[PDB]
Paper text:
Chromophore formation of green fluorescent protein (GFP) is a built-in type of posttranslational modification, i.e., the chromophore of GFP forms by an autocatalytic reaction of the backbone involving cyclization, oxidation, and dehydration reactions. For recombinant expression and purification of green fluorescent protein (GFP), one of the variants of GFP, GFPuv, was used in this study. Here, we demonstrated that the second posttranslational modification is generated at the side chain of the C-terminal Lys238 residue of the GFPuv, a mutant of GFP, when over-expressed in E. coli BL21 (DE3) pLysS strain. We determined the crystal structures of GFPuv form I and form II at 1.65 Å and 1.28 Å resolution, respectively.
The species with a higher mobility was named GFPuv form I, and that with a lower mobility was named GFPuv form II. The differences in the observed mass of form I and the theoretical one for GFPuv were quite small, and its isotope pattern was also similar to that of the theoretical mass spectrum. GFPuv form I was eluted at a lower salt concentration (~158 mM) than form II (~180 mM), which suggested that GFPuv form I and form II have a difference in their surface charges. The pI values of form I and form II were estimated as 5.76 and 5.64, respectively. The overall structures of GFPuv form I and form II are almost identical when these are superposed, showing 0.145 Å rmsd for Cα atoms of 233 residues, though slight differences arise mainly in the conformations of the turns consisting of Asn23–Gly24 and Asp155–Lys158. The C-terminal α-helices of GFPuv form I and form II also show almost the same structure in each other, except for the slight differences in the side chains of the C-terminal residue and the adjacent Glu235, where the electron densities at the end of the substituent groups in form II are more disordered than those in form I. The regions around the chromophore of both forms show almost the same structure, although the alternative conformers of the side chains of His148 and Thr203 could be modeled in GFPuv form I and form II, respectively. These observations support the fact that there is no large difference in the fluorescence characteristics between GFPuv form I and form II. Therefore, we concluded that the majority of native GFP exist as an unmodified form in the jellyfish photogenic organ in terms of the C-terminal residue.
Numbering used by the authors: 4 to 64, 68 to 238
The structure:
């Protein structure tokens, strides 16, 4: 399970979306190195111009690449579900605007880790920050808290992403997330903890299609009192 992530793993991301009548598709490719919690991914809109801002799709576009420190090995649900994979479902509610409903399956196809996503967008304002592309092209860091879900054999998370807006304000995107294994093999159900994420957005100067370059680092954290005792 975890042994599938000891080296660099090629990643493929595929999303099909429909946001207020606008149908679109995105393909992403890169690689993950879970030993450093490092993701390098480049996304291309294969249907033309993206109808929503790129930053709003960052969370939707593979937490199995998070760095789980050795003392937290027993809490890494995402890798324990591999190679069969897990389903990741989200609702993302944008304050004073519409919402996304996403469903993804993340699993290995051979050596490639594949994230296949369906996105539906509803009730957006045609003049709002999303459909109006009024978000800044950047991304803040966040701590995502993970909890187990015994009765559904998986985990859940909820967190509020802060998106910077052109006019100086901040647009909150409230995420509710649920992950469940695809396989029937047992998986690690974690103790409460969090994932510390940082993301940098950039552009490829040679890319003519609408696109996003993403560099991301994720580390699991929060289980500390045991280690701290060693240094008293």
């Amino acid at each position: 399970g975890e042994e599938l992530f000891t080296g660099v793993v090629p990643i493929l991301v595929e999303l099909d979306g429909d946001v207020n009548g606008h149908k679109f598709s995105v393909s992403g490719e890169g690689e993950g190195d879970a030993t450093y919690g490092k993701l390098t991914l480049k996304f291309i809109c294969t249907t033309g111009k993206l109808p929503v801002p790129w930053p709003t799709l960052v969370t939707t576009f593979v937490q199995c690449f998070s760095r789980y420190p050795d003392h937290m090995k027993r809490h890494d649900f995402f890798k324990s579900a591999m190679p069969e994979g897990y389903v990741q479902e989200r609702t993302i509610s944008f304050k004073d605007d519409g919402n996304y409903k996403t469903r993804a399956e993340v699993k290995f196809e051979g050596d490639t880790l594949v994230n296949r996503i369906e996105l539906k967008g509803i009730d957006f304002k045609e003049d709002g920050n999303i459909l109006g592309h009024k978000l800044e092209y950047n991304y803040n860091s966040h701590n995502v808290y993970i909890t187990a879900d015994k009765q559904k054999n998986g985990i859940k998370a909820n967190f509020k992403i802060r998106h910077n807006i052109e006019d100086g304000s901040v647009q909150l995107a409230d995420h509710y997330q649920q992950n469940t294994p695809i396989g029937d093999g047992p998986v690690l159900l974690p103790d409460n903890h969090y994932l510390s994420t940082q993301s940098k957005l950039s552009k490829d100067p040679n890319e003519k299609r609408d696109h996003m370059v993403l560099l991301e680092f994720v580390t699991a954290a929060g289980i500390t009192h045991g280690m701290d005792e060693l240094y008293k």
